Design a binder for this molecule. Structure first.
Ligand code: AU
Ligand code: AU
Ligand code: AU
Ligand code: AU
Lengths: 301, 301
Protein backbone atom coordinates (compact mmCIF):
# COMPACT_ATOMS: atom_id res chain seq x y z
CA UNK A 1 0.00 0.00 0.00
CA UNK A 2 0.91 3.66 0.21
CA UNK A 3 0.31 6.59 -2.12
CA UNK A 4 2.98 9.05 -3.23
CA UNK A 5 3.54 11.66 -5.93
CA UNK A 6 5.27 9.50 -8.54
CA UNK A 7 7.20 10.25 -11.72
CA UNK A 8 8.09 7.91 -14.57
CA UNK A 9 11.63 6.48 -14.67
CA UNK A 10 13.70 9.04 -16.55
CA UNK A 11 16.41 6.73 -17.91
CA UNK A 12 14.95 6.57 -21.41
CA UNK A 13 15.03 10.37 -21.68
CA UNK A 14 18.48 10.90 -20.12
CA UNK A 15 19.93 9.25 -23.22
CA UNK A 16 18.36 12.02 -25.32
CA UNK A 17 19.53 15.07 -23.35
CA UNK A 18 22.25 17.07 -25.11
CA UNK A 19 23.60 20.60 -24.71
CA UNK A 20 23.01 23.21 -27.43
CA UNK A 21 25.00 26.45 -27.60
CA UNK A 22 24.36 29.28 -30.06
CA UNK A 23 26.81 32.15 -29.73
CA UNK A 24 26.68 33.10 -26.06
CA UNK A 25 23.46 31.31 -25.00
CA UNK A 26 23.36 27.70 -23.78
CA UNK A 27 20.35 25.46 -23.20
CA UNK A 28 19.27 21.83 -23.42
CA UNK A 29 18.22 19.83 -26.46
CA UNK A 30 16.33 16.61 -27.14
CA UNK A 31 18.19 14.13 -29.36
CA UNK A 32 15.91 11.64 -31.14
CA UNK A 33 17.17 9.83 -34.26
CA UNK A 34 19.26 12.35 -36.30
CA UNK A 35 17.45 15.51 -35.15
CA UNK A 36 18.02 17.70 -32.08
CA UNK A 37 15.08 19.71 -30.72
CA UNK A 38 15.52 22.83 -28.59
CA UNK A 39 13.82 26.19 -27.97
CA UNK A 40 14.39 28.71 -30.74
CA UNK A 41 15.28 31.43 -28.22
CA UNK A 42 18.78 29.94 -28.12
CA UNK A 43 19.62 32.29 -31.03
CA UNK A 44 18.65 35.26 -28.84
CA UNK A 45 20.64 37.48 -26.52
CA UNK A 46 19.35 38.87 -23.24
CA UNK A 47 18.61 42.19 -24.96
CA UNK A 48 16.94 40.29 -27.81
CA UNK A 49 14.27 38.79 -25.53
CA UNK A 50 12.83 42.29 -25.02
CA UNK A 51 11.32 42.05 -28.53
CA UNK A 52 12.89 39.42 -30.80
CA UNK A 53 12.24 39.19 -34.54
CA UNK A 54 13.10 35.50 -34.62
CA UNK A 55 13.17 35.06 -38.41
CA UNK A 56 15.64 37.93 -38.90
CA UNK A 57 17.90 36.57 -36.16
CA UNK A 58 17.83 33.15 -37.82
CA UNK A 59 18.91 34.72 -41.14
CA UNK A 60 22.28 35.40 -39.50
CA UNK A 61 22.79 31.86 -38.18
CA UNK A 62 24.56 29.08 -40.09
CA UNK A 63 24.99 25.38 -39.36
CA UNK A 64 28.35 25.81 -37.61
CA UNK A 65 26.82 28.44 -35.30
CA UNK A 66 25.04 25.60 -33.42
CA UNK A 67 27.25 23.66 -31.00
CA UNK A 68 25.48 20.43 -30.03
CA UNK A 69 27.35 18.48 -27.35
CA UNK A 70 26.50 15.07 -25.87
CA UNK A 71 29.08 14.79 -23.13
CA UNK A 72 32.52 14.38 -24.72
CA UNK A 73 31.17 13.74 -28.23
CA UNK A 74 30.40 16.75 -30.43
CA UNK A 75 27.53 16.41 -32.89
CA UNK A 76 27.93 17.80 -36.41
CA UNK A 77 24.96 19.87 -37.57
CA UNK A 78 24.11 19.60 -41.27
CA UNK A 79 20.73 21.31 -41.28
CA UNK A 80 18.57 23.69 -39.24
CA UNK A 81 14.96 24.83 -39.54
CA UNK A 82 12.43 26.62 -37.33
CA UNK A 83 9.18 24.79 -36.54
CA UNK A 84 7.06 27.29 -34.60
CA UNK A 85 8.98 27.86 -31.36
CA UNK A 86 11.56 25.04 -31.57
CA UNK A 87 14.68 24.53 -33.66
CA UNK A 88 15.15 21.27 -35.57
CA UNK A 89 18.92 20.76 -35.74
CA UNK A 90 19.66 17.95 -38.21
CA UNK A 91 22.81 16.01 -37.30
CA UNK A 92 24.76 13.41 -39.26
CA UNK A 93 24.77 10.68 -36.57
CA UNK A 94 21.60 9.19 -35.10
CA UNK A 95 21.15 8.82 -31.36
CA UNK A 96 21.91 5.19 -30.40
CA UNK A 97 19.90 5.61 -27.17
CA UNK A 98 16.78 6.69 -29.08
CA UNK A 99 13.73 5.02 -27.52
CA UNK A 100 10.30 4.32 -28.95
CA UNK A 101 8.56 7.68 -28.91
CA UNK A 102 5.80 9.90 -30.25
CA UNK A 103 5.09 13.63 -30.07
CA UNK A 104 1.82 14.24 -28.21
CA UNK A 105 -0.01 17.44 -27.29
CA UNK A 106 -1.68 16.62 -23.99
CA UNK A 107 -4.99 18.07 -22.82
CA UNK A 108 -5.43 20.44 -19.86
CA UNK A 109 -5.48 18.59 -16.55
CA UNK A 110 -3.26 15.75 -17.81
CA UNK A 111 -0.01 14.93 -16.05
CA UNK A 112 3.53 14.20 -17.16
CA UNK A 113 6.96 13.68 -15.65
CA UNK A 114 9.62 16.38 -16.10
CA UNK A 115 13.38 15.79 -16.24
CA UNK A 116 15.09 18.98 -15.07
CA UNK A 117 18.28 19.58 -17.04
CA UNK A 118 21.18 22.04 -17.11
CA UNK A 119 23.92 22.07 -19.77
CA UNK A 120 22.41 18.86 -21.15
CA UNK A 121 22.91 16.94 -17.90
CA UNK A 122 19.93 15.63 -15.91
CA UNK A 123 19.44 17.15 -12.47
CA UNK A 124 16.19 15.67 -11.15
CA UNK A 125 12.75 14.35 -12.01
CA UNK A 126 9.34 15.38 -10.68
CA UNK A 127 5.66 14.98 -11.54
CA UNK A 128 3.81 17.89 -13.14
CA UNK A 129 0.35 18.62 -14.53
CA UNK A 130 -0.89 21.07 -17.16
CA UNK A 131 -3.05 23.58 -15.30
CA UNK A 132 -6.34 24.64 -16.95
CA UNK A 133 -4.74 28.01 -17.75
CA UNK A 134 -2.01 26.04 -19.60
CA UNK A 135 0.82 26.83 -17.18
CA UNK A 136 2.77 24.42 -15.00
CA UNK A 137 4.03 24.71 -11.41
CA UNK A 138 7.55 23.36 -11.71
CA UNK A 139 11.17 23.83 -10.70
CA UNK A 140 13.11 25.67 -13.41
CA UNK A 141 16.26 27.69 -12.75
CA UNK A 142 18.46 29.45 -15.29
CA UNK A 143 19.61 27.18 -18.09
CA UNK A 144 16.70 24.77 -17.61
CA UNK A 145 15.24 25.71 -21.01
CA UNK A 146 15.03 22.67 -23.26
CA UNK A 147 14.00 20.32 -20.46
CA UNK A 148 11.17 18.03 -21.48
CA UNK A 149 7.98 16.56 -20.06
CA UNK A 150 7.00 13.06 -21.07
CA UNK A 151 4.81 10.04 -20.46
CA UNK A 152 5.95 6.40 -20.67
CA UNK A 153 3.35 3.92 -22.02
CA UNK A 154 5.18 0.60 -21.40
CA UNK A 155 7.75 1.04 -24.19
CA UNK A 156 6.69 4.28 -25.83
CA UNK A 157 7.90 7.68 -24.62
CA UNK A 158 5.20 10.29 -25.25
CA UNK A 159 7.04 13.59 -25.20
CA UNK A 160 4.60 16.43 -24.58
CA UNK A 161 6.36 19.46 -23.06
CA UNK A 162 9.44 21.59 -23.60
CA UNK A 163 10.23 24.45 -21.23
CA UNK A 164 10.64 27.95 -22.64
CA UNK A 165 9.45 30.67 -20.28
CA UNK A 166 9.11 31.57 -16.62
CA UNK A 167 6.31 34.10 -16.28
CA UNK A 168 6.82 37.10 -13.95
CA UNK A 169 4.18 35.51 -11.70
CA UNK A 170 6.48 32.59 -10.84
CA UNK A 171 4.91 29.86 -13.01
CA UNK A 172 6.33 28.36 -16.20
CA UNK A 173 5.16 28.18 -19.80
CA UNK A 174 6.32 26.08 -22.72
CA UNK A 175 5.48 24.35 -25.97
CA UNK A 176 4.77 20.87 -27.24
CA UNK A 177 7.43 19.09 -29.26
CA UNK A 178 6.00 20.57 -32.48
CA UNK A 179 6.67 24.10 -31.22
CA UNK A 180 3.20 25.31 -30.26
CA UNK A 181 2.91 27.00 -26.88
CA UNK A 182 0.40 25.74 -24.33
CA UNK A 183 -1.84 28.75 -23.84
CA UNK A 184 -1.58 32.35 -25.05
CA UNK A 185 2.14 32.72 -24.34
CA UNK A 186 4.89 33.92 -26.66
CA UNK A 187 8.63 33.31 -26.34
CA UNK A 188 9.30 36.96 -25.56
CA UNK A 189 10.15 38.78 -22.32
CA UNK A 190 7.08 40.95 -21.78
CA UNK A 191 4.11 41.27 -19.41
CA UNK A 192 2.30 37.96 -19.86
CA UNK A 193 -0.26 36.62 -17.42
CA UNK A 194 -2.14 33.34 -17.25
CA UNK A 195 -5.83 33.27 -16.46
CA UNK A 196 -7.58 32.41 -13.22
CA UNK A 197 -6.08 29.04 -12.29
CA UNK A 198 -8.95 26.63 -11.62
CA UNK A 199 -8.79 23.20 -9.98
CA UNK A 200 -8.93 19.98 -12.00
CA UNK A 201 -12.10 18.66 -10.38
CA UNK A 202 -11.88 15.19 -11.94
CA UNK A 203 -8.35 14.88 -10.55
CA UNK A 204 -9.38 15.81 -7.01
CA UNK A 205 -12.03 13.07 -7.10
CA UNK A 206 -9.51 10.45 -8.22
CA UNK A 207 -7.19 11.53 -5.41
CA UNK A 208 -10.05 11.16 -2.93
CA UNK A 209 -10.68 7.71 -4.39
CA UNK A 210 -7.04 6.81 -3.76
CA UNK A 211 -7.47 7.93 -0.15
CA UNK A 212 -10.29 5.43 0.41
CA UNK A 213 -8.19 2.48 -0.77
CA UNK A 214 -5.41 3.48 1.65
CA UNK A 215 -7.33 4.00 4.89
CA UNK A 216 -8.24 7.69 4.89
CA UNK A 217 -12.04 7.63 5.08
CA UNK A 218 -13.00 10.38 7.55
CA UNK A 219 -14.09 12.62 4.66
CA UNK A 220 -16.73 10.05 3.63
CA UNK A 221 -20.14 11.46 4.55
CA UNK A 222 -23.75 10.27 4.26
CA UNK A 223 -24.83 12.70 1.52
CA UNK A 224 -25.31 12.57 -2.23
CA UNK A 225 -25.84 15.31 -4.82
CA UNK A 226 -26.57 15.96 -8.49
CA UNK A 227 -24.07 16.74 -11.22
CA UNK A 228 -25.65 20.17 -11.72
CA UNK A 229 -25.86 21.06 -8.02
CA UNK A 230 -22.25 19.97 -7.49
CA UNK A 231 -21.20 22.16 -10.42
CA UNK A 232 -22.76 25.20 -8.73
CA UNK A 233 -20.59 24.58 -5.67
CA UNK A 234 -17.59 23.74 -7.87
CA UNK A 235 -17.99 26.96 -9.86
CA UNK A 236 -18.15 28.93 -6.60
CA UNK A 237 -14.77 27.54 -5.46
CA UNK A 238 -13.10 27.97 -8.88
CA UNK A 239 -13.32 24.29 -9.79
CA UNK A 240 -13.55 22.77 -13.26
CA UNK A 241 -17.12 21.88 -14.32
CA UNK A 242 -17.49 18.13 -13.92
CA UNK A 243 -18.85 16.49 -17.06
CA UNK A 244 -20.29 13.06 -17.82
CA UNK A 245 -16.96 12.09 -19.39
CA UNK A 246 -15.24 12.76 -16.06
CA UNK A 247 -17.86 10.52 -14.45
CA UNK A 248 -17.06 7.64 -16.81
CA UNK A 249 -13.28 7.88 -16.39
CA UNK A 250 -13.83 7.53 -12.63
CA UNK A 251 -15.88 4.39 -13.35
CA UNK A 252 -13.24 1.78 -12.44
CA UNK A 253 -12.45 3.66 -9.22
CA UNK A 254 -16.15 4.01 -8.42
CA UNK A 255 -16.74 0.30 -9.02
CA UNK A 256 -13.68 -0.87 -7.08
CA UNK A 257 -14.50 1.29 -4.04
CA UNK A 258 -18.26 0.76 -4.28
CA UNK A 259 -18.81 4.52 -3.88
CA UNK A 260 -20.83 6.17 -6.64
CA UNK A 261 -19.13 9.20 -8.17
CA UNK A 262 -22.02 11.41 -7.06
CA UNK A 263 -21.56 10.34 -3.43
CA UNK A 264 -17.87 11.17 -3.81
CA UNK A 265 -18.81 14.61 -5.17
CA UNK A 266 -20.99 15.08 -2.08
CA UNK A 267 -18.03 14.38 0.21
CA UNK A 268 -15.86 16.73 -1.85
CA UNK A 269 -18.69 19.27 -1.63
CA UNK A 270 -18.47 19.31 2.17
CA UNK A 271 -14.67 19.55 2.10
CA UNK A 272 -15.04 22.65 -0.09
CA UNK A 273 -17.75 24.02 2.22
CA UNK A 274 -16.34 23.01 5.63
CA UNK A 275 -12.61 22.90 4.94
CA UNK A 276 -10.55 20.22 6.67
CA UNK A 277 -10.86 21.08 10.39
CA UNK A 278 -7.08 20.69 10.61
CA UNK A 279 -7.10 17.08 9.38
CA UNK A 280 -5.12 15.68 6.46
CA UNK A 281 -5.86 13.33 3.56
CA UNK A 282 -3.06 11.08 2.28
CA UNK A 283 -0.58 13.25 4.17
CA UNK A 284 -1.74 16.51 2.55
CA UNK A 285 -3.55 19.35 4.32
CA UNK A 286 -5.14 20.57 1.07
CA UNK A 287 -6.92 19.01 -1.92
CA UNK A 288 -4.44 17.60 -4.45
CA UNK A 289 -5.41 17.95 -8.12
CA UNK A 290 -2.27 16.67 -9.90
CA UNK A 291 -3.20 12.98 -10.06
CA UNK A 292 -5.25 11.88 -13.07
CA UNK A 293 -7.83 9.09 -12.76
CA UNK A 294 -5.26 6.93 -14.57
CA UNK A 295 -2.48 7.96 -12.18
CA UNK A 296 -4.49 6.52 -9.28
CA UNK A 297 -5.14 3.15 -10.92
CA UNK A 298 -1.49 3.08 -12.03
CA UNK A 299 -0.25 3.15 -8.43
CA UNK A 300 -3.05 1.06 -6.91
CA UNK A 301 -2.40 -1.74 -9.43
CA UNK B 1 12.69 29.78 -9.86
CA UNK B 2 10.19 27.34 -8.41
CA UNK B 3 10.47 24.66 -5.75
CA UNK B 4 9.23 21.09 -6.14
CA UNK B 5 9.69 17.69 -4.51
CA UNK B 6 12.52 16.33 -6.67
CA UNK B 7 14.06 12.90 -7.14
CA UNK B 8 17.38 11.98 -8.71
CA UNK B 9 17.36 10.68 -12.30
CA UNK B 10 16.82 6.94 -12.02
CA UNK B 11 18.50 5.86 -15.27
CA UNK B 12 21.70 4.68 -13.58
CA UNK B 13 19.70 2.35 -11.32
CA UNK B 14 17.29 1.02 -13.96
CA UNK B 15 20.28 -0.76 -15.51
CA UNK B 16 20.73 -2.66 -12.24
CA UNK B 17 17.14 -3.85 -11.68
CA UNK B 18 16.65 -7.58 -12.26
CA UNK B 19 13.97 -10.08 -11.26
CA UNK B 20 14.74 -12.82 -8.73
CA UNK B 21 12.50 -15.87 -8.30
CA UNK B 22 12.96 -18.56 -5.64
CA UNK B 23 10.43 -21.37 -5.89
CA UNK B 24 7.06 -19.61 -5.89
CA UNK B 25 8.10 -16.13 -4.67
CA UNK B 26 9.25 -13.33 -6.98
CA UNK B 27 10.85 -10.01 -6.09
CA UNK B 28 13.39 -7.50 -7.40
CA UNK B 29 17.17 -7.62 -7.22
CA UNK B 30 20.03 -5.15 -7.57
CA UNK B 31 22.70 -6.17 -10.09
CA UNK B 32 26.10 -4.55 -9.49
CA UNK B 33 29.24 -6.14 -10.98
CA UNK B 34 28.84 -9.96 -10.72
CA UNK B 35 26.60 -10.00 -7.62
CA UNK B 36 22.81 -9.69 -7.31
CA UNK B 37 21.36 -8.31 -4.07
CA UNK B 38 17.81 -9.02 -2.93
CA UNK B 39 15.84 -9.54 0.31
CA UNK B 40 16.40 -12.94 1.88
CA UNK B 41 12.65 -13.45 2.36
CA UNK B 42 12.51 -14.56 -1.27
CA UNK B 43 13.22 -18.10 0.03
CA UNK B 44 10.07 -17.88 2.16
CA UNK B 45 6.47 -18.86 1.52
CA UNK B 46 3.46 -16.92 2.76
CA UNK B 47 3.09 -19.39 5.64
CA UNK B 48 6.82 -19.08 6.33
CA UNK B 49 6.60 -15.34 7.08
CA UNK B 50 4.57 -16.16 10.21
CA UNK B 51 7.83 -17.27 11.88
CA UNK B 52 10.70 -18.08 9.50
CA UNK B 53 13.90 -19.82 10.56
CA UNK B 54 15.86 -18.31 7.68
CA UNK B 55 19.03 -20.39 8.06
CA UNK B 56 17.13 -23.69 7.96
CA UNK B 57 15.19 -22.58 4.88
CA UNK B 58 18.47 -21.64 3.18
CA UNK B 59 19.87 -25.12 3.90
CA UNK B 60 17.33 -26.46 1.39
CA UNK B 61 18.20 -23.98 -1.38
CA UNK B 62 20.83 -24.60 -4.07
CA UNK B 63 22.26 -22.35 -6.77
CA UNK B 64 19.79 -23.46 -9.44
CA UNK B 65 16.88 -22.65 -7.10
CA UNK B 66 17.51 -18.93 -7.77
CA UNK B 67 16.16 -17.65 -11.10
CA UNK B 68 17.72 -14.26 -11.85
CA UNK B 69 16.27 -12.63 -14.97
CA UNK B 70 17.30 -9.36 -16.64
CA UNK B 71 14.65 -9.04 -19.31
CA UNK B 72 15.23 -11.74 -21.94
CA UNK B 73 18.69 -12.71 -20.62
CA UNK B 74 18.86 -15.27 -17.82
CA UNK B 75 21.72 -14.92 -15.34
CA UNK B 76 23.56 -18.04 -14.16
CA UNK B 77 24.04 -18.19 -10.39
CA UNK B 78 27.28 -19.77 -9.21
CA UNK B 79 27.19 -18.79 -5.54
CA UNK B 80 24.80 -17.65 -2.82
CA UNK B 81 25.32 -16.39 0.73
CA UNK B 82 23.22 -14.62 3.37
CA UNK B 83 24.50 -11.26 4.64
CA UNK B 84 22.12 -10.27 7.44
CA UNK B 85 18.77 -9.74 5.69
CA UNK B 86 19.88 -9.77 2.03
CA UNK B 87 20.99 -12.54 -0.32
CA UNK B 88 24.22 -12.14 -2.29
CA UNK B 89 23.67 -14.12 -5.50
CA UNK B 90 27.01 -14.46 -7.30
CA UNK B 91 26.60 -14.64 -11.09
CA UNK B 92 29.10 -15.49 -13.81
CA UNK B 93 28.58 -12.36 -15.95
CA UNK B 94 29.11 -8.83 -14.66
CA UNK B 95 26.53 -6.12 -15.22
CA UNK B 96 27.67 -3.95 -18.17
CA UNK B 97 25.44 -1.09 -16.95
CA UNK B 98 27.11 -1.05 -13.52
CA UNK B 99 27.65 2.56 -12.44
CA UNK B 100 30.05 4.06 -9.93
CA UNK B 101 28.54 3.21 -6.56
CA UNK B 102 29.03 2.75 -2.84
CA UNK B 103 26.93 1.19 -0.08
CA UNK B 104 25.98 3.84 2.49
CA UNK B 105 23.91 3.66 5.67
CA UNK B 106 22.25 7.06 5.86
CA UNK B 107 21.36 8.85 9.09
CA UNK B 108 17.81 9.57 10.31
CA UNK B 109 16.32 12.62 8.62
CA UNK B 110 18.35 12.17 5.43
CA UNK B 111 16.61 11.82 2.08
CA UNK B 112 16.97 9.53 -0.90
CA UNK B 113 15.21 8.76 -4.16
CA UNK B 114 13.32 5.47 -4.52
CA UNK B 115 12.79 3.56 -7.78
CA UNK B 116 9.62 1.50 -7.40
CA UNK B 117 9.97 -1.85 -9.16
CA UNK B 118 7.87 -4.92 -9.92
CA UNK B 119 9.21 -8.11 -11.54
CA UNK B 120 12.51 -6.28 -12.04
CA UNK B 121 10.95 -3.55 -14.19
CA UNK B 122 10.94 0.09 -13.02
CA UNK B 123 7.51 1.59 -12.36
CA UNK B 124 8.17 5.07 -10.97
CA UNK B 125 10.49 7.26 -8.93
CA UNK B 126 9.76 9.44 -5.91
CA UNK B 127 11.60 11.25 -3.12
CA UNK B 128 11.66 9.73 0.36
CA UNK B 129 13.21 10.47 3.74
CA UNK B 130 14.18 8.24 6.66
CA UNK B 131 11.86 9.20 9.51
CA UNK B 132 13.38 9.50 13.01
CA UNK B 133 11.66 6.23 13.94
CA UNK B 134 13.52 4.65 10.97
CA UNK B 135 10.45 4.04 8.81
CA UNK B 136 9.63 5.58 5.43
CA UNK B 137 6.35 6.85 3.97
CA UNK B 138 6.44 5.41 0.48
CA UNK B 139 4.45 3.68 -2.25
CA UNK B 140 5.00 -0.09 -2.15
CA UNK B 141 2.51 -2.62 -3.50
CA UNK B 142 2.91 -6.39 -3.68
CA UNK B 143 6.09 -7.47 -5.43
CA UNK B 144 7.85 -4.17 -4.70
CA UNK B 145 10.33 -5.90 -2.38
CA UNK B 146 13.88 -5.45 -3.63
CA UNK B 147 13.32 -1.86 -4.75
CA UNK B 148 16.15 0.42 -3.74
CA UNK B 149 16.72 3.92 -2.41
CA UNK B 150 19.76 5.82 -3.56
CA UNK B 151 21.59 9.13 -3.79
CA UNK B 152 23.55 10.37 -6.83
CA UNK B 153 26.69 12.43 -6.05
CA UNK B 154 27.64 13.60 -9.59
CA UNK B 155 28.88 10.20 -10.80
CA UNK B 156 28.58 8.03 -7.72
CA UNK B 157 25.38 6.17 -6.85
CA UNK B 158 25.07 5.89 -3.06
CA UNK B 159 22.66 3.02 -2.52
CA UNK B 160 21.18 3.22 0.97
CA UNK B 161 17.81 1.43 1.15
CA UNK B 162 16.21 -1.84 0.14
CA UNK B 163 12.53 -2.46 0.80
CA UNK B 164 11.51 -5.49 2.85
CA UNK B 165 8.42 -4.91 4.98
CA UNK B 166 5.15 -3.00 5.10
CA UNK B 167 4.16 -2.61 8.74
CA UNK B 168 0.49 -3.17 9.72
CA UNK B 169 0.34 0.58 10.40
CA UNK B 170 0.76 1.41 6.70
CA UNK B 171 4.41 2.52 6.67
CA UNK B 172 7.38 0.62 5.26
CA UNK B 173 10.59 -0.77 6.72
CA UNK B 174 13.76 -2.02 5.09
CA UNK B 175 17.50 -2.54 5.31
CA UNK B 176 20.66 -0.95 4.00
CA UNK B 177 22.56 -2.71 1.24
CA UNK B 178 24.59 -4.64 3.83
CA UNK B 179 21.41 -6.24 5.20
CA UNK B 180 20.87 -4.34 8.46
CA UNK B 181 17.35 -3.08 9.07
CA UNK B 182 16.75 0.59 9.79
CA UNK B 183 15.21 0.49 13.25
CA UNK B 184 14.03 -2.39 15.44
CA UNK B 185 12.30 -4.30 12.64
CA UNK B 186 12.70 -7.94 11.65
CA UNK B 187 11.83 -9.55 8.32
CA UNK B 188 8.96 -11.49 9.85
CA UNK B 189 5.18 -11.05 9.68
CA UNK B 190 4.31 -10.17 13.28
CA UNK B 191 3.05 -7.22 15.34
CA UNK B 192 5.77 -4.62 14.84
CA UNK B 193 5.31 -0.93 15.57
CA UNK B 194 7.54 2.07 15.03
CA UNK B 195 7.92 4.71 17.71
CA UNK B 196 6.34 8.13 17.96
CA UNK B 197 7.17 9.71 14.60
CA UNK B 198 8.78 13.10 15.26
CA UNK B 199 9.42 15.89 12.76
CA UNK B 200 12.88 16.56 11.31
CA UNK B 201 13.19 20.09 12.68
CA UNK B 202 16.34 20.95 10.71
CA UNK B 203 14.52 19.93 7.52
CA UNK B 204 11.50 22.14 8.23
CA UNK B 205 13.83 25.13 8.66
CA UNK B 206 15.55 24.47 5.33
CA UNK B 207 12.15 24.23 3.65
CA UNK B 208 11.17 27.57 5.20
CA UNK B 209 14.45 28.97 3.89
CA UNK B 210 13.53 27.76 0.40
CA UNK B 211 10.19 29.55 0.74
CA UNK B 212 11.92 32.90 1.32
CA UNK B 213 13.99 32.63 -1.87
CA UNK B 214 10.81 31.93 -3.87
CA UNK B 215 8.49 34.70 -2.66
CA UNK B 216 6.61 33.15 0.26
CA UNK B 217 7.48 35.49 3.15
CA UNK B 218 4.24 35.99 5.09
CA UNK B 219 5.48 33.64 7.82
CA UNK B 220 8.44 35.96 8.52
CA UNK B 221 7.80 37.68 11.85
CA UNK B 222 9.64 40.24 13.98
CA UNK B 223 10.66 37.86 16.80
CA UNK B 224 13.77 35.94 17.78
CA UNK B 225 14.35 33.17 20.32
CA UNK B 226 17.02 31.02 21.95
CA UNK B 227 18.05 27.51 20.98
CA UNK B 228 16.88 26.21 24.36
CA UNK B 229 13.55 28.05 24.38
CA UNK B 230 12.82 26.91 20.82
CA UNK B 231 13.58 23.33 21.86
CA UNK B 232 10.93 23.55 24.60
CA UNK B 233 8.34 24.49 21.97
CA UNK B 234 9.75 21.92 19.54
CA UNK B 235 9.56 19.15 22.15
CA UNK B 236 5.94 20.11 22.86
CA UNK B 237 4.97 19.63 19.19
CA UNK B 238 6.95 16.37 18.78
CA UNK B 239 9.82 18.01 16.90
CA UNK B 240 13.45 16.90 16.81
CA UNK B 241 15.71 18.80 19.24
CA UNK B 242 17.64 21.34 17.20
CA UNK B 243 21.38 21.14 17.86
CA UNK B 244 24.30 23.42 17.05
CA UNK B 245 25.22 21.11 14.16
CA UNK B 246 21.80 21.75 12.62
CA UNK B 247 22.52 25.47 13.01
CA UNK B 248 25.80 25.19 11.10
CA UNK B 249 24.35 23.15 8.22
CA UNK B 250 21.77 25.92 7.75
CA UNK B 251 24.66 28.41 7.58
CA UNK B 252 24.76 28.89 3.79
CA UNK B 253 20.98 29.33 3.71
CA UNK B 254 21.12 31.74 6.66
CA UNK B 255 23.87 33.78 4.99
CA UNK B 256 22.23 33.85 1.55
CA UNK B 257 18.84 34.94 2.92
CA UNK B 258 20.31 37.25 5.58
CA UNK B 259 17.98 35.71 8.19
CA UNK B 260 19.70 34.29 11.26
CA UNK B 261 18.72 30.71 12.04
CA UNK B 262 17.33 31.80 15.42
CA UNK B 263 15.01 34.32 13.75
CA UNK B 264 13.87 31.51 11.45
CA UNK B 265 13.20 29.32 14.49
CA UNK B 266 11.09 32.16 15.90
CA UNK B 267 8.95 32.24 12.76
CA UNK B 268 8.64 28.44 12.87
CA UNK B 269 7.75 28.79 16.56
CA UNK B 270 4.72 30.92 15.70
CA UNK B 271 3.65 28.57 12.91
CA UNK B 272 3.67 25.74 15.46
CA UNK B 273 1.79 27.92 17.97
CA UNK B 274 -0.64 29.73 15.64
CA UNK B 275 -1.01 27.23 12.80
CA UNK B 276 -1.36 28.58 9.27
CA UNK B 277 -4.66 30.52 9.34
CA UNK B 278 -5.58 28.70 6.12
CA UNK B 279 -2.56 29.99 4.20
CA UNK B 280 0.01 27.87 2.35
CA UNK B 281 3.80 27.86 2.06
CA UNK B 282 5.35 26.74 -1.25
CA UNK B 283 2.00 25.24 -2.22
CA UNK B 284 1.69 23.12 0.95
CA UNK B 285 -0.85 23.64 3.73
CA UNK B 286 1.39 21.92 6.30
CA UNK B 287 5.07 22.01 7.30
CA UNK B 288 7.21 19.85 4.99
CA UNK B 289 10.11 18.01 6.63
CA UNK B 290 11.41 15.85 3.75
CA UNK B 291 13.90 18.34 2.29
CA UNK B 292 17.39 18.32 3.77
CA UNK B 293 19.42 21.54 4.04
CA UNK B 294 21.40 20.17 1.08
CA UNK B 295 18.23 19.44 -0.91
CA UNK B 296 17.33 23.14 -0.75
CA UNK B 297 20.70 24.40 -1.96
CA UNK B 298 20.65 21.68 -4.63
CA UNK B 299 17.50 23.10 -6.23
CA UNK B 300 18.24 26.78 -5.58
CA UNK B 301 21.64 26.45 -7.31
AU1 AU C 1 16.93 28.67 -20.23
AU1 AU D 1 5.92 4.24 -30.12
AU1 AU E 1 7.59 -8.04 -2.05
AU1 AU F 1 32.14 5.91 -6.36
Amino acid sequence: SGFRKMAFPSGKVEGCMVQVTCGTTTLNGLWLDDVVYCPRHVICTSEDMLNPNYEDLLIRKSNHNFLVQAGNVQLRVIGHSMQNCVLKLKVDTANPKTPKYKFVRIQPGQTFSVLACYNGSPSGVYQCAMRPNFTIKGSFLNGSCGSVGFNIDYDCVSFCYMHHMELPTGVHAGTDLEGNFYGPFVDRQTAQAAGTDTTITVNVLAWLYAAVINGDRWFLNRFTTTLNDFNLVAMKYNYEPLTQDHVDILGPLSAQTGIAVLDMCASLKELLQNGMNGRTILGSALLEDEFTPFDVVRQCS
